[PDB]
Write a protein that binds this ligand. Structure first.
Ligand code: MFL
Ligand code: MFL
Ligand code: CL
Lengths: 306, 306
């Protein structure tokens, strides 16, 4: 048993990670086939970044200006291209280690693994959810940009995130791999802010189910709520309204534990109202909301990858 | 910006995960050069494991009684030895993906990443800590055995743990890669109890520095303490004694923050006494003790691996 925050195994993503340098700026690219995907702000300097004309600065750039590096190997760049906020560097060699892959745009509430890299080199990996306000709570230092977020369904790598900026509050913003920002954010020096976050209710119930599967059940009660009456409470505390689709999505864990959603919902209403009364759940002193239904099923039924 | 429980990238260990089957029992093997290491309870039937004679059981097995699979490819076993609680299977092929590596035996309070495997397939990666009672709070289902713990020091993978058993309350025990157990446990299906866990004081302090490095300051007080005065209070909240070497080891972080260790101790001493009274630190409502001084430097100064 046990229950941890669990990243995907990162090896298939390490294989793709390169260093990209334009003038003074060095960060990370994602090397799939003969293309290297990196944030388009690799091109500009500390100046302009007030409000930089990427179309215009790219025209001036020479392929020679991009020093791309895979360990102890300079890759010849032979073409450059811009999609939204991502630079595409055509190079004269396809990546021997390209895995099967997809570019997907995840919905808020959905979780991925992040491989934090510096100078094309991976530092560490960690799990994190796309907040409803389209920020993520990462761990990103200068040089981290171009680091990516991904899910691994079997042998297929689904790339969902490339890193761009930090925000005030120590939260992060970035793009899908077609270079569109999650949320209303922009690749400038321009001053920017998250907007009010909400608690991902569906995920809190999932984790409660996770605790029950793992013996931690002190908070189970003989009481029941309607969906409506449950939302009337949780919504007061800035929790996502819970929907029938949410309740359906919780079907499998409801069945595995034998506890109905609207029963667990009465445990959740109580924990919000009276707090945890000095107790922990899965060794947490608050209600963790960064595990999806599927994340619990994965960890707790033990589904493997390759 | 941000701080996070961060696992080492698992790429280099993934290429060493094999499946080992002996009759009706399947678990994970660690394949380094021409040797596969697994737990020795792979030669047992579910009735042998109540009180087995592993020496006797191993005498009654041939090389062919070990089906070792690396992807599709089966590996021919050409020898077998038992070192303490691990099986060493000599195979006919050297692992091309074998990293530079060594075997270490870690101290309590030291952290490492776990690559949870089922059937020689890597499933998940998570950081944890050798608890002072010689257990690990991991995430392990049936089939997980042979999954290892490890650090990366630049490019050298240090293997520190192989997984063997679950103990009461959903904590875990295993061995170093010489098959010696951490703590007083045995390779047996017997009633075994872990012993009372305490909090890793030097780690909580390391994390209080992380809080302060990431702009969490509220818990700083205008007081200092003696080591002795600190231990008197910590003893009474099940905190491991803080020694002069723990203070000395905390020096670099003290110097980075300008906050004297024994002043940080005095802030911790107040937190144990008055509790946290509903406030968080790095988004935790309890004091984290699973980051080493070196982990905090690692992540805050962003050190990288290859
Ligand atoms: C990225 O460009 C990089 O790694 N380049 C080498 C960095 C990564 C961030 C800096 C440290 N933490 C990070 O996550 N991003 C930026 O520097 C980013 C580039 C903009 C085009 C998007 N960026 C520029 C300017 C200002 C900020 N934000 C900022 O200063 O935020 C506060 C919280 C005020 C410090 C920013 O992210
Ligand atoms: C491991 O052997 C395996 O994966 N084999 C295929 C397995 C690890 C799993 C099982 C559930 N959680 C885990 O960590 N270990 C065992 O099953 C071990 C075998 C060890 C040689 C003795 N094992 C066997 C019997 C009983 C127990 N523990 C047990 O009964 O746990 C409680 C009830 C909590 C005391 C055990 O770990
Ligand atoms: Cl907590």
């Amino acid at each position: 048993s046990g229950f941890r925050k669990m990243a995907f195994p990162s090896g298939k993503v390490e294989g793709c990670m390169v260093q990209v340098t334009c003038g003074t700026t060095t960060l990370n690219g994602l090397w799939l086939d003969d293309v290297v995907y990196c944030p388009r702000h690799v091109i500009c300097t500390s100046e302009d970044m007030l409000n930089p004309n990427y179309e215009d600065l790219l025209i001036r750039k020479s392929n020679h200006n991009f020093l791309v590096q895979a360990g102890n190997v300079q890759l010849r760049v032979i073409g450059h291209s811009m999609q939204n906020c991502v630079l595409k560097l055509k190079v004269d060699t396809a990546n021997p280690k390209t895995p099967k892959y997809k570019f997907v745009r995840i919905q808020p509430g959905q979780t991925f693994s992040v491989l934090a890299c510096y100078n094309g080199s991976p530092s560490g990996v960690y799990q994190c959810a796309m907040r409803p306000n389209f920020t993520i709570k990462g761990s990103f230092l200068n040089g981290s940009c171009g680091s990516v977020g991904f899910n691994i369904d079997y042998d297929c790598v689904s790339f969902c995130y490339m890193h761009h900026m930090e925000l005030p509050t120590g939260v992060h913003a970035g793009t899908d791999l077609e270079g569109n920002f999650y949320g209303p954010f922009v690749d400038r020096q321009t001053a920017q802010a998250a907007g009010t976050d909400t608690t991902i209710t569906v995920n809190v119930l999932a984790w409660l189910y996770a605790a029950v599967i793992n013996g931690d059940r002190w908070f189970l009660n003989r009481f029941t709520t309607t969906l409506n009456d449950f939302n009337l409470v949780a919504m007061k505390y800035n929790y996502e309204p819970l929907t029938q689709d949410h309740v359906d999505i919780l079907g499998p864990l409801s069945a595995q534990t034998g506890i109905a959603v609207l029963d667990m919902c009465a445990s959740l209403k109580e924990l919000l109202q009276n707090g945890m009364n000095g107790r922990t759940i899965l060794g947490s002193a608050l209600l963790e909301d960064e595990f999806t239904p599927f994340d619990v099923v994965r960890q707790c039924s033990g589904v493997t990858f390759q």
